[PDB]
Write a protein that binds this ligand. Structure first.
Ligand code: SF4
Lengths: 99, 50, 89, 77, 99
């Protein structure tokens, strides 16, 4: 993909029952200066020791979303990460007549 | 039913002059063990002669 | 503006001829916690803590493990980003 | 070219303090004098200094270019 | 130079809170706790579900089940520690319960 910034994802298998799934959000600081980037896209990202993509296009891990920012003076903050949030509890039933 | 809604403020720090990678992965797959992320990268864009 | 001048050849060669042409490379100290696993000063494959440590520099193609800036666990949203979302079977 | 007090990587990752130089190339701020080094409002250009703190940076609305990495001390703990 | 004492004593300007107890690393409470009594499998079962809160660097769960007797005393029937958001109880008695 691009050199300055990149994005990739492997789709997550649909659930069967009504169960929730955890999500791990990690940020790693690789090096200091402008670096060129990954060598082979998502195959260069290893969780435990398994590449996200196999030698071919087949996926090994499903549900991974990776954002890569090469070191630059002007770059945008990573997407999809949150700092704080406030919630207001409605608790109101939705009926057909009144949205 | 409609229960609530949250207003989320994202990360607003650009992290200038640092090459970082962020990963979001479903964690039920790996079980109890923590995940150890290793990357296969190239390195600095140096200044070479013309 | 006076003194004695000595010959340095025998003093220089005392270490070795190679050290007179090029310095010597450094070896990390040995820790018995590794069970004999040997380390080097230019490679690191694991994720280290952040505060009070320097931001590393990568100079060539290599597998890298990097200092952690953030790590959290939360509940994943059902929406996959598209307009259509299907929950359950 | 002497190497007595020099250490190579040289850049520290700190949780609450910015390591950049004020109005430098990396901080990238160029504007009216805003505050003192004790986060007290001021307008004189002579006594305008950043406190290298998050509030001192918020005075400039320059949070994007903050040198330090916030909330590390939670993980290091 | 005697003038440096006043320069040293003035200290600096620190940003934050001295107490700093607004947000430590104690996890919050689990989001949605529900227990369902089903007889579909031919027996009485209890299905407990909860949603993981925002926990820093890993999370695990601790469960305690208590029998609330008619007297008012509460007996401890069982305890369990698990890392999965769902837990099932089987072969229970006739009294009231609390999870
Ligand atoms: S705190 Fe903000 S304004 Fe002050 S030197 Fe650092 S980046 Fe610049």
């Amino acid at each position: 993909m691009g050199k300055g910034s990149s994005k990739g994802h492997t789709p997550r298998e649909a659930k069967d029952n009504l169960k929730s799934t955890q999500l791990l959000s990690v940020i790693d600081a690789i090096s200091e200066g402008p670096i060129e980037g990954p060598v082979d896209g998502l195959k260069s990202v290893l969780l435990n020791s398994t590449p996200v993509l196999d030698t071919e296009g087949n996926t090994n891990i499903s549900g991974v979303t990776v954002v890569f920012r090469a070191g630059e003076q002007e770059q945008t903050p990573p997407e999809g990460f949150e700092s704080s949030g406030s919630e207001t509890v409605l608790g109101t039933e939705v009926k057909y007549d009144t949205p | 039913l409609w229960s609530s809604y949250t207003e989320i403020i994202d990360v607003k720090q650009c992290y200038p002059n640092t090459a970082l990678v962020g990963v979001q992965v479903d964690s039920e797959q790996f079980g109890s063990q923590q995940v150890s992320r290793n990357y296969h990268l190239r390195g600095r864009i140096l200044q070479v002669p013309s | 503006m006076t003194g004695i001048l000595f010959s340095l050849g025998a003093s220089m060669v005392l270490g070795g001829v190679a050290q007179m042409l090029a310095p010597k490379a450094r070896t990390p100290r040995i820790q018995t916690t590794d069970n004999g696993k040997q380390n080097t000063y230019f490679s690191s494959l694991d994720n280290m803590v952040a505060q009070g440590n320097v931001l590393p520099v990568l100079y060539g193609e290599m597998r890298v493990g990097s200092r952690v800036v953030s790590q959290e666990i939360s509940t994943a949203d059902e929406g996959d980003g598209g307009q259509v979302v299907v929950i359950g079977r | 070219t002497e190497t007595d007090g020099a250490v190579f990587p040289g850049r520290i990752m700190l949780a609450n303090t910015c390591t950049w130089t004020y109005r430098g190339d990396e901080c990238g701020y160029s504007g009216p004098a805003v505050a003192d080094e004790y986060d007290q409002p001021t307008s004189d250009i002579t006594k305008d200094k950043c406190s290298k703190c998050l509030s001192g940076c918020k005075f400039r609305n320059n949070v994007g270019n903050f040198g330090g990495f916030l909330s590390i001390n939670k993980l290091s703990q | 130079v005697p003038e440096k004492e006043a320069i040293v004593d003035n200290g600096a300007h620190f940003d934050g809170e001295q107490s700093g107890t607004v947000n430590g690393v104690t996890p919050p409470a689990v989001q949605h706790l529900t227990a369902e009594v089903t007889a579909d499998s031919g027996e009485y079962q209890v299905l407990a579900r909860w949603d993981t809160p925002k926990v820093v660097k890993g999370v695990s769960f601790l469960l305690r089940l208590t029998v609330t007797a008619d007297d008012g005393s509460e007996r401890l029937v069982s305890t369990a520690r698990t890392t999965e958001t769902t837990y099932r109880f089987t072969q229970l008695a006739l009294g009231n319960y609390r999870l």
